[PDB]
Design a protein around this ligand. Sequence first.
Ligand code: 2PW
Ligand code: 2PW
Ligand code: MN
Ligand code: MN
Length: 331
Amino acid sequence: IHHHHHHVINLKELKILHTSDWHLGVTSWTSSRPVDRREELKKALDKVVEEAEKREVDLILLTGDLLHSRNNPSVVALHDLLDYLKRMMRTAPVVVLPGNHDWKGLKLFGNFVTSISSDITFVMSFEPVDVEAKRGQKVRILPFPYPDESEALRKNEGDFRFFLESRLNKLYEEALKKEDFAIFMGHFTVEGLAGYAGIEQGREIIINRALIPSVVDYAALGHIHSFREIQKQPLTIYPGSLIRIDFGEEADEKGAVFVELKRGEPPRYERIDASPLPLKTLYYKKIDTSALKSIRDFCRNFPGYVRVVYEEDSGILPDLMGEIDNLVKIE
Ligand SMILES: CC[C@@H](C)N1C(=O)/C(=C\c2ccc(O)cc2)SC1=S
Ligand SMILES: CC[C@@H](C)N1C(=O)/C(=C\c2ccc(O)cc2)SC1=S
Ligand SMILES: [Mn+2]
Ligand SMILES: [Mn+2]
């Protein structure tokens, strides 16, 4: 019973697990009623890990912000990240495209970890890397990380947009230089999203979906919280977060993406539902006796969190947050 990669001859298939935007260490609604989302997030994370072992994925892709805090993650958040990273590695080889971190030492540690292990790879530049999947599949990764060299901080609108296109063009040329499979990994915002509102904000890199290399077998994206099927040629998917961060994601479906690739057959995928706690926003003109009736009746049998939005004040409001544990925000 070994624990290394297999080597099947003439194998032309590739099962991929794509999850993104874990936001580990997040505490929601700190200005109204602080709620630690760790237990819910870990539960959702466990379900994704189990599904990876269930379907026996060949490669695991990680994008978006795995940590909620960009430049100051808690010890607990870091612990959970390293925990689930190891859990992923026991299942299949992992490829990680980090988001915004603002720490220079991270690239050093990223290259170090990548060098000492054959089951995890950190792409923190535009340099394409070749990786080996669980069953010995040759997979070329075309990474498009967040633009560095202070180009995001300061750059002319003409050159910067031409800079992004030039980088994408080189990724296209190098995608043709592939052995078996070629996967695109990007950390940006697709031009004209319908209708993910509330990002970032934050700095945004706007890229047309047509500029993404068409010769790749799969385009793995992140940074946005909602699931999005951008296109089919090539298959471009935002997995979305695993939990509902704020009430803007009330009607969102959270989870991961399972992608299967064949040499002759076109790409197919299934959504892996994480089934996180639901959210709900109740609207009222004034919080009258009728409004209090509706609020208490709804929050009674609701397994998730509730926000109440009203227009104008009308007398002293009862301690609703006291009698109702579900109510996290009356704004
Ligand atoms: C080093 C790879 C991995 C564990 N990782 C981080 O450590 C990341 C961010 C980070 C680490 C330490 C800090 O003080 C701040 C950010 S993101 C990421 S993937
Ligand atoms: C794998 C950890 C190893 C490279 N290491 C450090 O990172 C050490 C110290 C250190 C790292 C980051 C800091 O911000 C400060 C000290 S000592 C030591 S051995
Ligand atoms: Mn991001
Ligand atoms: Mn995010």
